Design a protein around this nucleic acid. Sequence first.
RNA 1: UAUCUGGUUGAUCCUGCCAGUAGUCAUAUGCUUGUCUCAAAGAUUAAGCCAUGCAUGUCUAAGUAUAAGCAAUUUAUACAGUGAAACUGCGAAUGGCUCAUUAAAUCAGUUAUCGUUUAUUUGAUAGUUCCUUUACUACAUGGUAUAACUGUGGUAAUUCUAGAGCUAAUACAUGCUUAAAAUCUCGACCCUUUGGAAGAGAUGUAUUUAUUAGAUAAAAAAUCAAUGUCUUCGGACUCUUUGAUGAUUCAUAAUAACUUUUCGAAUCGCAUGGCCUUGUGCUGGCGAUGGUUCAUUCAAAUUUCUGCCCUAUCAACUUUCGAUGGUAGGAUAGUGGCCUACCAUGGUUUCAACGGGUAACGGGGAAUAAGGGUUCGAUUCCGGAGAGGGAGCCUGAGAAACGGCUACC
RNA 2: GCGGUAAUUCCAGCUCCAAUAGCGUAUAUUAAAGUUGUUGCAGUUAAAAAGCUCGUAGUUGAACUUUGGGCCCGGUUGGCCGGUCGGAUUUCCAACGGGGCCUUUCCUUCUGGCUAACCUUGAGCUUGGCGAACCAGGACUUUUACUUUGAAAAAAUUAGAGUGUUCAAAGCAGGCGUAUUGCUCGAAUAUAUUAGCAUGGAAUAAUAGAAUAGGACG
RNA 3: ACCCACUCGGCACCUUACGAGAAAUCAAAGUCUUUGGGUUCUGGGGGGAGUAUGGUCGCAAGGCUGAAACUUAAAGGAAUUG
RNA 4: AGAAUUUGGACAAACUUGGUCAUUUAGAGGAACUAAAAGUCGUAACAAGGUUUCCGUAGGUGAACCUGCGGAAGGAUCAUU
RNA 5: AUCCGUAACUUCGGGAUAAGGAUUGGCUCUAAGGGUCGGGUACGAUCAACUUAGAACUGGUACGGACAAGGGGAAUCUGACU
Lengths: 258, 144, 123, 187
Amino acid sequence: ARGPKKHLKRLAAPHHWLLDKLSGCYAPRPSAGPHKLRESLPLIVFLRNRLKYALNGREVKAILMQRHVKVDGKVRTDTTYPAGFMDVITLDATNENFRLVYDVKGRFAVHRITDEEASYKLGKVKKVQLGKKGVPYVVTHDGRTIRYPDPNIKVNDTVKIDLASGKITDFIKFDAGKLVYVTGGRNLGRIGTIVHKERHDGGFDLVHIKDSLDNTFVTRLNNVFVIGEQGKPYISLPKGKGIKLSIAEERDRRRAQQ
Amino acid sequence: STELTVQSERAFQKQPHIFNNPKVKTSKRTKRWYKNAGLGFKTPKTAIEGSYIDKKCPFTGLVSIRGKILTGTVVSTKMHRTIVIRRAYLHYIPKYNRYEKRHKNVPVHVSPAFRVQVGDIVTVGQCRPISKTVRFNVVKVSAA
Amino acid sequence: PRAPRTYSKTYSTPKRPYESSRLDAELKLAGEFGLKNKKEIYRISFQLSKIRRAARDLLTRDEKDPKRLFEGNALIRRLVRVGVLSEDKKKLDYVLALKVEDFLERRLQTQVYKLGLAKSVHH
Amino acid sequence: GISRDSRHKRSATGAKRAQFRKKRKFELGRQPANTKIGAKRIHSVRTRGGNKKYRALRIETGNFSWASEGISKKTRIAGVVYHPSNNELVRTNTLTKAAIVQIDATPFRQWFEAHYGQTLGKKSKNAERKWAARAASAKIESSVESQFSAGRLYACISSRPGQSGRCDGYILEGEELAFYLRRLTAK
RNA sequence: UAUCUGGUUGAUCCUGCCAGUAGUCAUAUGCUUGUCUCAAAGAUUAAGCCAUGCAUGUCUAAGUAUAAGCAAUUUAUACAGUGAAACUGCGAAUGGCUCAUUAAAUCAGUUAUCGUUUAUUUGAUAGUUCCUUUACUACAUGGUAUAACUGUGGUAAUUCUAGAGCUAAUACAUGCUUAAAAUCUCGACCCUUUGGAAGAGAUGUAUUUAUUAGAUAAAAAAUCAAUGUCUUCGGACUCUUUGAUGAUUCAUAAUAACUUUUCGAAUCGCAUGGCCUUGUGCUGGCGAUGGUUCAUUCAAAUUUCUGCCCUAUCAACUUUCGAUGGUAGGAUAGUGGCCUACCAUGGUUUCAACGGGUAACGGGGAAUAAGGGUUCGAUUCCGGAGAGGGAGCCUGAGAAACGGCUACC
RNA sequence: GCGGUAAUUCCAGCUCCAAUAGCGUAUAUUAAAGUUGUUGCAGUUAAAAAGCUCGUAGUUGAACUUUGGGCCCGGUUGGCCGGUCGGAUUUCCAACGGGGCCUUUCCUUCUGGCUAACCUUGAGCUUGGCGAACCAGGACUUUUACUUUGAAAAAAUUAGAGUGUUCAAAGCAGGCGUAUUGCUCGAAUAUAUUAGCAUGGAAUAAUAGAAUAGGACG
RNA sequence: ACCCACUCGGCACCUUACGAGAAAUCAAAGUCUUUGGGUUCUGGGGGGAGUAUGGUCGCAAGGCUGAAACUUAAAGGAAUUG
RNA sequence: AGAAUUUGGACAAACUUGGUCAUUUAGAGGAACUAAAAGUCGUAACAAGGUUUCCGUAGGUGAACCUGCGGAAGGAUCAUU
RNA sequence: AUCCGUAACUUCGGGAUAAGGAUUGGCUCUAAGGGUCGGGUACGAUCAACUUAGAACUGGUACGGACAAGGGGAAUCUGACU
Ligand SMILES: [Mg+2]
Ligand SMILES: [Mg+2]
Ligand SMILES: [Mg+2]
Ligand SMILES: [Mg+2]
Ligand SMILES: [Mg+2]
Ligand SMILES: [Mg+2]
Ligand SMILES: [Mg+2]
Ligand SMILES: [Mg+2]
Ligand SMILES: [Mg+2]
Ligand SMILES: [Mg+2]
Ligand SMILES: [Mg+2]
Ligand SMILES: [Mg+2]
Ligand SMILES: [Mg+2]
Ligand SMILES: [Mg+2]
Ligand SMILES: [Mg+2]
Ligand SMILES: [Mg+2]
Ligand SMILES: [Mg+2]
Ligand SMILES: [Mg+2]
Ligand SMILES: [Mg+2]
Ligand SMILES: [Mg+2]
Ligand SMILES: [Mg+2]
Ligand SMILES: [Mg+2]
Ligand SMILES: [Mg+2]
Ligand SMILES: [Mg+2]
Ligand SMILES: [Mg+2]
Ligand SMILES: [Mg+2]
Ligand SMILES: [Mg+2]
Ligand SMILES: [Mg+2]
């Protein structure tokens, strides 16, 4: 009321942060940033709850304020910087590099990567427009504006960014047979090789996807993110590789290794 | 429709920024702007060749169709460029596990491209607010 | 403001307060197993009622239904673990047919009594 | 103050709506300017988002476009001769969009004489070359040429002076001019 | 855990209620009360009244410090540690409380903005500004207050303040310095007919208006109006530039001008390095702050569809002066009777309008439930509304704000 | 209902019973209540069929239009075998459900490419058939209800999986090593009406079509 | 005009209960806990009460519509022996 | 640059006066209902209740009630080929 | 005089100018309301009315400016009324 909200109560935070319903009345409200609030890891949670490198918010502020951690090559000495899908988090101390990437259950995974893979990320182009003075630009899912792209880069395509300069090195087009990552909804985290898309001039393009096990599903085009061709992707995938084992098979494997 | 003596109003009725230079002179009675409203609705010949202006028409006017596409039957044609359609539907009551007839009345703007009579089935499209009660525009007629 | 703690009650009072048969059975159980309250028997009956409701909801379904398989095998495992249900009886009908005494025999009190060490349930 | 909301006046059925939600500023309205002529007096309005809005009072000049020739010139506004919404704005010489006004025409005479050469009403080789190349394009019309006798061109205000601070417009041509002349000279 | 029992008769079977029976994150009260964990709590009647005290302030390396403050630097004679005060900048519009109003209103889910604003984040993004622009200029950088402070005071009193004297800025407030090239206009003069010219000026971004481009399913010929790029002037002719949406007068660009004229860094810390024609010479790093536009995010506003309790001992309602619609205008951040002028006569209704009542904020949900259902939902989350009642408004991105002003009661 | 000089009912004593750190009373509400009745009441006499007929908002509404037969393909269950040491294969008799084709059966296509599976056959893996199986864009295109699947429906709550809060209510924890340096499983899943979105089916129930042919093909 | 046989449609009647029903009784009051052919109306313990009040019709008499307070554990149906 | 003051306009609190709606509430007297009470007057109904009961309507009478017209059996008649 | 608004009761015709309120000048304008002629077998010209509504401006807030011109309401007795 009367202005923007600055607090976030627990039980109103997204469930994929895995915050205790106890342990406080409030949750961290992600600052304005390149990622939506309901799609944001932020760093306090990433460092305290997932990695256990800190036990409080004081310790996280202490870590961030001596500039050990950087997001996408930039330091981000903020406690509630919204880090999201495909963001690269580099801890020069520990020589660690993480890529924010969903597990198949719908949560963010602690996916360690190499320094050569942390030198780039992927971006889903949202719009291609003409800017002032006739300069074309593309906008990605992380709010990155990139001028003078290849004219063949159309919307719903994926773009390889170099993360030191904001330049484009390559791009994948949206087409059948292309490997996708699902970013949003019930099928969040799956990886399944587009077969065909359904248009519906007027609203909400759909797209059909089929996992390695030939399990088919359907999603909206806003929840889809191409990451390469069938076989080779353009990134390192986490454990599970977006297969979504049924609960029965999950317990069978947990009993196989115990 | 009735074609209603196009320049009947006190202001001159023209399409904005559609300028017919008097210096050069050709055929094409007057530079007439029209558009394809989209969604497979055909732009009628009456709209392409007519002389009416209709600021609020979705073919020659400055409104767009976006959102819902509804369908109804005309129960009133007594307003000017405005009609009322009856949308009949069935509402489910779970306790009794059976339905009851319900209706809404929806006022919609109709271009002179169409001549609608009471009883005609129309399909309308959501537009921006056209008046206190009107948010829909006729975009196809489905009867005679 | 804070997330509320969840709580539930674990017993259900019977509808008829004064039924001599039920009273006799309850007191026989209390004397055989060393109990101070009918609340303990009510609690065991409550747990058993929940288990039976679950088993009925599953048995109404088809076999090879994934929910039935998963939850029924889980229930059976969870009861075989405490020994309330023998490993001879793993078909989800004996679950319905179990008893109150099958639960009540696995309490640490009577289990101590069985494993020597007390020579009485009150001891 | 003035409210721009709909939770006042009745629903379409005819029902009176109860008082919900004391007046809000995101539905505010403000008083008109009623822009008059002469002695520029522009007051600024601070609107939502900052976003200055220039409320013209007492405006004298205007940029008026001749579209057949593709130019625009700054002229004085003499007075209002027709408004399609209210005759009292004409009586008061109040400026609004869609107001028909008279303007000076001297910059247009000058431009015509320097661009085409001939005249309106009734030296160097470079200039004669320009004027000969720009021939068969100086026989504009009868009504505008007749207006140039009096140096009072009929124009329509196309701008919103109470919003931007400008009385800009376009000179009347063709069927618009015929329409407004029929509306005026009839009596 | 799909259960019923007592009471009408002299007795029987019924209908039928009364009574019993069990439960209640439903209250109260009575009696009693030893332990562990967990934990609601002035909602119901009075959205009745409030003593007192607290609840919103805030700084770094990095806007302003001669504290006549504390220190000691001793690298410092302009400052250069710490730092009250005060100026400046942000925030105070979040949060928390309550449920009075409110019955297609709120709200739920589902839509839209091709109908608009958006501080802050985040990412990109101004070589064009000396105005007769050849002394008109400070650009190694221009000007004026004023606070805090000193001191004189007023009042019984308040987070009251006056007069007098200083002094700063990322305050106010002006104001310069950076390419070249191309294209357009005027155009001196040479003069030709094929006709050419030196020179001057304009050309960023933002505002306002008018105009133009923003295209395209396919293939060849006839000659001309004038020759068009080059000519072996027969005429070889290609090259020609055009993005997105389901859809636009979209994005964007180009002409003409318009503006009382926006922005385009007179800011700050740390490091102090490279090149010499050794001058306080020319270059030069990591950052902070600020700024135009676009996009992004946090939102906001409006909005589509369907859905809400009782009542007909409420059946007709709306429309004077807005009801339904049209044209135009005004206003608005924007759509729209939101308001005005003119015009028309519409709009809702037994499929329950309108009116009345609610011991009615709405939902998520809670209790009890064989199944179906009944009742509840002030209350830990979401939305809305309010700050004793009304109304109005300043500041700001954002309030019709109330631990902010103005008035009336 | 007890109590009117032998009170099993009052005031007490004794004993006994029920729940038990809880028990009672009041009010409200739920079940009981098939005493609200959609599931699921009753209406001759117990309360209740309007005096009788007609009739407008509604509810309900006869039958009929592709059936039958065949041929194939590959799935799920089974079944000897267990050719593995109480786990599984594949050739198998059958059942259960899908798809395609032919039987008079266009079960919308226009322009094009992959030409696809291709008379394409080079000596037993080669030089060259038919547009969707991959896309583009178009001519168009009877309308609903219904049902399946899917997306969507905040979290908490609910049901529910796993797990030491010492049990439990709960919580989302935790567990395992040479514990010297560390390793690791998780934080599922389901429900969530009605309205809207897409999707397959196309019986059931409505709706329309060519009849003074301004009808279809071409 | 009568007789015989048959048939459609009526007013009814006799016998039985397969069935129904609390029974009296019922060819519908059956095909209803094995509960759904379609549809309208009415009732929810007895009184107060078809009262009061308000509307509406009516010349009026009155009709139609129609409560509440309060009170009460029984009123009532069909049968049984006295 | 700009204070006091000030013209007109829209927003419009609040007050007064009327009107209207609703909810509570007083009231001489009047007219009912309910109960209590071993009250007074009768005895209308239950049997053919001593004139068979009842319905509608109308009139009348201390009161139950009586009478007239028409109807019903819930009758005291399922019955005279 | 124009506009608003009008109760009980009622023989439904009235009550009723019920009650009770606002406005009214001068000036300058605006709008609307008409007749007669004209067209091979939509309009133009011309002529003349006082009626209504509205807006500005104006004044020592005055204006049916003199004249002219209802006081009203709640009830009773009584005669129906003229
Ligand atoms: Mg708040
Ligand atoms: Mg935050
Ligand atoms: Mg009795
Ligand atoms: Mg007895
Ligand atoms: Mg009871
Ligand atoms: Mg920025
Ligand atoms: Mg408008
Ligand atoms: Mg309008
Ligand atoms: Mg309330
Ligand atoms: Mg309340
Ligand atoms: Mg508020
Ligand atoms: Mg208070
Ligand atoms: Mg306030
Ligand atoms: Mg306060
Ligand atoms: Mg007793
Ligand atoms: Mg005793
Ligand atoms: Mg039940
Ligand atoms: Mg009953
Ligand atoms: Mg009777
Ligand atoms: Mg009866
Ligand atoms: Mg009858
Ligand atoms: Mg029907
Ligand atoms: Mg539907
Ligand atoms: Mg017969
Ligand atoms: Mg007969
Ligand atoms: Mg009842
Ligand atoms: Mg009753
Ligand atoms: Mg009798």
